[PDB]
């Protein structure tokens, strides 16, 4: 098959928009594993954007857990997902002519979105990256929301469909990609928010055997509160209830849902618990053999070259609760929001009272007891720490305790339209400073902001090529270069050596370890 | 379809599983393992955690370090290769170890042991002890895990000899071991 | 009366060795408040050192809580206390001719020792200070050990005798000191270790009404574990038991003790509890109206110009437990010594388990989990924090919440023979760097070490004169001057502004507040 | 000797003391105080916390800010001036105050009151409440001290109206006050 060509300093690139990786889940192929692609009779029109999977933007919207650009520029994010259909199992590719400023080039597949219910790979134009990196960038669509992960916990509706869509799409590359100047033995998955979570889940599976070698979890992982749903029935019941499908039997209630139109099914509204998710991956016993954390602990996976990191103040949204106030963030509201923190997370709650006040303590800066800002600040941190930072470390810790080589980072950069927040790392990874402000990235891209985009891409790309970011292409940005005299040491369990991304780059040791430990070592051992 | 489905052999102990096939394959250290992986199609069986092309996996004198998750990737390429996988929870209970320490009059007895599963610690003095002016606890640095018996103030007649009875609840035919230390 | 004259750079000085302030507690004046001085019939031989009060050095020795010089140089500390007698209620004075390198000069009285059972004012030759400061320095002896504070908690043996000896000695100055070129309206008590504790206790009393205005608590205070004994009977019983005096009645058992010889009584050996004291001040309901902490909270005192401070690593001794080991301080011994920390202090101990592991947590540096040194270090801190640092802050906090003006410090300097430890501030306060190494201060006194002595004295003395240390004599040491550019801001409850003593002097805010709070705010509220 | 020894007057309530004299002099806010300080010698009496030379101290309409420790320093200079001192524990219970807050469905009710002694908080809904899926607690920042009633998830019928019954155990003749808030 063949498609179309584009260009902007750099070496030009070919796109492949609307290539399928499996027969679309339409009839009673819905809530069924994807079977492989229906056979292509003619030169397929691989020329324009494939439509999006079933999602609703207009209400049911996990604010806190979504990237910033998403929920700052919804009107702009809407434009991509407007052409919806159930037939959405199509990936895209971006492959270049020449090396940017035919031996088999590596493959960087993008998992995406932010919640399990929101996004498409189309939003991410991974074209610049391909050109500048000289590798094959793949952006897909997996099944979302209900269609992705509805489950009974029975043979009737096993769930984890969305992953299996990612797995198949990956299997497409493995078998095919070779015929785009691609390499089947240096395939590299990379994610953000939920994608990250997904990245980490595929790793632990068996079903991703000969499909990839390298993995990049940009801000997020599989052991967090909202990466994995450990109560599938309860929420499917509430869904089945709002469409009159909740029968006492399992198998019959599943076969009911088939017949309700896809349009009607997803845009339904079920809220989950606080800091949880209702529709998402589950411990099935096939693509997720056991509880992710337990799998990670016992070493029930194989050695994928990992690259995890995390941003300064991820869940900025968490403190968008009383952001516009600026007497600060209220004294006694601090207590409150923490009380709900402990309850919907650890709230078992026989000995909770301690847990609340002792976790309050660690984050209240006792220098200035009275300043609201230097609670707000800290509350951001609190949430940040628990819902990304710590988990991420502990995953690394395990994956390097079993000797997968693995490198760690921290990201420290906004670019202002309106604290480095969750998501803000993306445009730099996808090179969007090099093209100019797109609709969902409005920023004054500084001379510096570019340098940063180059350096991240150079690192990230190299990593796909070798499993060593700082090797292959060495650090340069003279086309000073502030990343020249710095080597990204390998992470390990002992000296938790990581790379500080930013204008001031360097290696440091034990990110935030003090707080890390509080959450990893003391707190769960209270009860 | 090209199928697979695992059944145990070798030396299991007190069997339990879930909706798909055997979640757990418990085995003791020093025994022999045998996991037979069935087929429909024929396919070619594949055990892995170099892909070993044995139908039946087998390990003589199984060690703690051999435990983990193994899968069976049977395939003739008739649809997706079926992949059924299983836990190898190797079990044991070592010789437990016992240090001490002294001052005005408090005496500590520290008791470690490496086990799998995590052992249960019991403390004696002729008959078993639990909370008057006498404490027991687990710590943060659980390199065992460990258990500690503290005597607060040596009263005339808590000067007798003690035992750190460790147990794995007798599971998979494994005896309870213990350890003694005297006092004066 | 008249006495003797001395000189060594500086302006010469007169000493008054062996002046009594009360009739000595001998017969049934033992365990009785001091009555005033027996009337002096001739020109009193105020010429040589008055003997020491009943103490035993050779066994019963609260190591941890004593100054370093004391327990490093016992052979040298022995020499002063060898001439013992029960008749020991004699003070000393040091008054100068001329101002060192005719308005009524102020009075600095020294309380002393280290435990309630050990020391004499004789050990402290407060002569340099007097000359360089141009004020009257007084060093006394109060009743020690059993003789100082034995109590039943009855009218039979009220206790707090040692304080009443200090109070009377102070009352001597009030009435008399005027006739040495002294000033009765600028009298200034100052202490160390226990003396400190005593300083703070007199403050809270009524019996120190018109006697002093200014107070200096060098490292220690009244609310600590070992400043105040809240179980007087139990230990007096054990004493009465070892001399056959423990009768069932109170009054008769007291009148027994009278007849046993003083020599025999003190050198008896009773160990108290861990981090407690058996013989010390008690809540009588006269000189200590109520529990010191409760008194301090409710504002049941009057506004004395305070000057409290504290040294970097006070209870170094605490970690002299396994100091000579240097694989560090043992991993699991850290647990142990903490377990005994929580038990003999907070060990109530219904929910102790938490308290142990959560206080372990705050002090284990998670940067290097495995290094023994960076536990040892911390264990020093732990103990340091709890048994001086925090208490000291909270006392200040209260005394400035009720608007006594008050200034705070931290001391940061050894001078090595064999971390700034408890006591090491003294020789600098008493000017011993200016004379050269005495027997109980062996150090290579550096050019710098002098500068420091000057600056502390200049501060301390000024403070007696005004109740403002940095005012009167401004900071100079050119006979550069590193303390020139720096003003000792007043302490308050809000910005806990304090002076960092040392080679690098300055003002900082909220000393160690993070840990301060843990001990002051969270921990007691666990149970 | 030159002595002194205190006896109460004015308006005490349910008296308690120790081995020397009255440790405590409890009084309500709005009442009158009278503390008579006896003498032997004759001496000159001295009340203080500029030394008032009244034998008997007196304050009309006593306020919270007048409470504290006062001593009696009677003296003719016949030996040491005797000094007996006493606690003035002024008592009260204000109008209690009640804020709130809301989200998915959790509702908090914060209840402060300034009191002396420290008040005891009781929560109602027709009849009094304590632990099913409903929590009460005290915090660290006890600016009252305060008490908080949290409703975890609004179940159909915990939508009724609540009361924050504060009490000082009726001590020194002081009534219990309370406060109500409704819910929809």
Curated annotation (Swiss-Prot), chains A, C:
Main location, first listed in the record: membrane
Keyword Cell membrane: yes
Keyword DNA damage belongs to the record: no
Topological type in the membrane: Single-pass type I membrane protein
GO MF: cell adhesion molecule binding; identical protein binding; neurexin family protein binding
Cysteines paired by S-S bonds: 53-88, 245-256, 415-443
Gene Ontology process terms (BP): gephyrin clustering involved in postsynaptic density assembly; inhibitory synapse assembly; insulin metabolic process; jump response; locomotory exploration behavior; modulation of chemical synaptic transmission; neuromuscular process controlling balance; neuron cell-cell adhesion
Domain of life: Eukaryota
GO cellular component, one term: dendritic shaft
Residue intervals annotated with topology Extracellular: 1-527
Glycosylation, residue list: 45, 83, 444
Alphabetical keyword list: Cell adhesion, Cell membrane, Cell projection, Disulfide bond, Glycoprotein, Membrane, Phosphoprotein, Postsynaptic cell membrane, Signal, Synapse, Transmembrane, Transmembrane helix
Tissue distribution of the protein: Detected on hippocampus neurons, especially at inhibitory synapses. Detected in retina, in the outer and inner plexiform layer. Detected in pancreas, in islet of Langerhans beta cells (at protein level). Expressed in brain, spinal cord and dorsal root ganglion. Detected in brain, and at lower levels in pancreas islet beta cells.
Compartments where found: Cell membrane; Postsynaptic cell membrane; Presynaptic cell membrane
Family, as annotated: Belongs to the type-B carboxylesterase/lipase family.
Subunit structure: Interacts with neurexins NRXN1, NRXN2 and NRXN3. Interaction with neurexins is mediated by heparan sulfate glycan modification on neurexin. Interacts (via its C-terminus) with DLG4/PSD-95 (via PDZ domain 3). Interacts with PATJ. Interacts with GPHN. Interacts with MDGA1 and MDGA2. Found in a complex with MAGI2 and IGSF9B, where it interacts with MAGI2 (via WW 1, WW 2 and PDZ 2 domains). Identified in a complex of 720 kDa composed of LHFPL4, NLGN2, GABRA1, GABRB2, GABRG2 and GABRB3. Interacts with LHFPL4; leading to mutual regulation of the protein level and synaptic clustering.
Functional summary from the UniProt entry: Transmembrane scaffolding protein involved in cell-cell interactions via its interactions with neurexin family members. Mediates cell-cell interactions both in neurons and in other types of cells, such as Langerhans beta cells. Plays a role in synapse function and synaptic signal transmission, especially via gamma-aminobutyric acid receptors (GABA(A) receptors). Functions by recruiting and clustering synaptic proteins. Promotes clustering of postsynaptic GABRG2 and GPHN. Promotes clustering of postsynaptic LHFPL4.
Listed name of the protein: Neuroligin-2
Taxonomic lineage of the native organism: Eukaryota, Metazoa, Chordata, Craniata, Vertebrata
Residues of the full protein shown: 51 to 609 of 836
Swiss-Prot record, chains B, D:
Residue ranges annotated for the Ig-like domain, each copy included: 1-87, 96-180
Protein purpose: Required for radial migration of cortical neurons in the superficial layer of the neocortex. Plays a role in the formation or maintenance of inhibitory synapses. May function by inhibiting the activity of NLGN2.
Residues with attached carbohydrate: 19
Cysteine-cysteine disulfides: 37-72, 111-164
TM spans (from-to): none
Gene name per UniProt: MDGA1
Record protein name field: MAM domain-containing glycosylphosphatidylinositol anchor protein 1
Covered residues, full protein: 24 to 234 of 955
Location(s), subcellular: Cell membrane
Assembly description: Interacts heterophilically through its MAM domain with proteins in axon-rich regions and through its Ig-like domains with proteins in differentiating muscle. Interacts (through the Ig-like domains) with NLGN2.
Tissue expression profile of the protein: Has been found in brain, heart, skeletal muscle and kidney. Found to be overexpressed in tumor tissues.
């Amino acid at each position: 098959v063949r498609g179309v060509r584009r260009e902007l300093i750099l070496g030009p690139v070919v796109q492949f928009l609307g290539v399928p990786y499996a027969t679309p889940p339409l009839g009673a192929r819905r809530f069924q594993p994807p079977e492989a692609p229906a056979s292509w009779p003619g030169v397929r029109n691989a020329t324009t954007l494939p439509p999006a999977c079933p999602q609703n933007l207009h209400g049911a919207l996990p604010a806190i857990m979504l990237p910033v650009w998403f929920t700052d520029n919804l009107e702009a994010a809407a434009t991509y997902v407007q052409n919806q259909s159930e037939d959405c199992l199509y990936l895209n590719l971006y492959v270049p002519t020449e090396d940017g400023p035919s031996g088999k080039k590596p493959v960087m597949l993008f998992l995406h979105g932010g919640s399990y219910m929101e996004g498409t790979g189309n939003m991410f134009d991974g074209s610049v990256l391909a050109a500048y990196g000289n590798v094959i960038v793949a952006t897909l669509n997996y099944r979302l929301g209900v269609l992705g992960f509805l489950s009974t916990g029975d043979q009737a509706a096993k769930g984890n469909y969305g992953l299996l869509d990612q797995i198949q799409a990956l299997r497409w590359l493995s078998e095919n990609i070779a015929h785009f100047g691609g390499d089947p033995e240096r395939i590299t998955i990379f994610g953000s928010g939920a994608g990250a979570s997904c990245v980490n889940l595929l790793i632990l599976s068996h079903h991703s055997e000969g499909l990839f070698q390298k993995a990049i979890a940009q801000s997020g992982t599989a052991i967090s509160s909202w990466s994995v749903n450990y109560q599938p029935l309860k929420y499917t019941r509430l869904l089945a209830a709002k469409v009159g499908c909740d029968r006492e039997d399992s198998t019959e209630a599943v076969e009911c849902l088939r017949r309700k139109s896809s349009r009607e099914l997803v845009d339904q509204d079920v809220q989950p618990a606080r800091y949880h998710i209702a529709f998402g991956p589950v411990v099935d016993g096939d693509v997720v053999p056991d509880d992710p954390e337990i799998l990670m602990q016992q070493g029930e996976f194989l050695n994928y070259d990992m690259l995890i990191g995390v941003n300064q103040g991820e869940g900025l949204k968490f403190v968008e609760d009383s952001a516009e106030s600026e007497d600060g963030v209220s004294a006694s509201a601090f207590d409150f929001t923490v009380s709900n923190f402990v309850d919907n997370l650890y709230g078992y709650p026989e000995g909770k009272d301690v847990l609340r006040e002792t976790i309050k303590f660690m984050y209240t800066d006792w220098a200035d007891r009275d300043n609201g800002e230097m609670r707000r600040k800290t509350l951001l941190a609190l949430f940040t720490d628990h819902q990304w930072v710590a988990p991420a470390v502990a995953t690394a810790k395990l994956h390097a305790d079993y000797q997968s080589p693995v490198y760690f980072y921290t990201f420290y950069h906004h670019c202002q339209a309106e604290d480095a927040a969750h998501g803000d790392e993306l445009p730099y990874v996808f090179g969007v400073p090099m093209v100019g402000a797109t609709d969902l990235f409005p920023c004054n891209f500084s001379k510096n902001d570019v340098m940063l985009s180059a350096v991240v891409m150079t690192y990230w790309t190299n990593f796909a090529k070798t499993g060593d970011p700082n090797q292959p292409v060495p650090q340069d940005t003279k086309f000073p270069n502030r990343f020249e005299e710095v080597v990204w040491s390998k992470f390990n369990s002992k000296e938790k050596q990581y790379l500080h991304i930013g204008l001031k780059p360097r290696v440091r040791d034990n990110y935030r370890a003090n707080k890390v430990a509080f959450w990893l070592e003391l707190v769960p051992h209270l009860h | 379809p090209a199928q697979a489905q695992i059944v145990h052999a070798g030396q299991a102990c007190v069997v339990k599983e879930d909706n798909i096939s055997e979640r757990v394959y418990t085995i003791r250290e020093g025994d022999t393992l045998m996991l037979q992986c069935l087929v429909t199609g024929r396919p070619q069986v594949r055990w892995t955690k170099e892909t070993s092309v044995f139908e039946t996996l087998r390990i003589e004198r199984i060690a703690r370090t051999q435990g983990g998750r193994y899968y069976c990737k049977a395939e003739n390429g008739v649809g997706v290769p079926a992949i059924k996988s299983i836990r190898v929870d190797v079990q044991y209970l070592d010789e437990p170890m016992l240090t001490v320490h002294q001052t005005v009059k408090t005496v500590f007895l520290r008791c470690t042991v490496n086990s799998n599963p995590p052992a249960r610690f019991i403390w004696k003095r002729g008959s078993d002890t639990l909370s008057n002016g006498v404490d027991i606890y687990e710590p943060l640095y659980t390199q065992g895990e460990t258990k500690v018996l503290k005597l607060k103030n040596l009263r005339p007649q808590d000067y007798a000899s003690y035992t750190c009875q460790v147990s794995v609840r007798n599971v998979c035919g494994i005896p309870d071991k213990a350890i003694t230390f005297r006092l004066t």
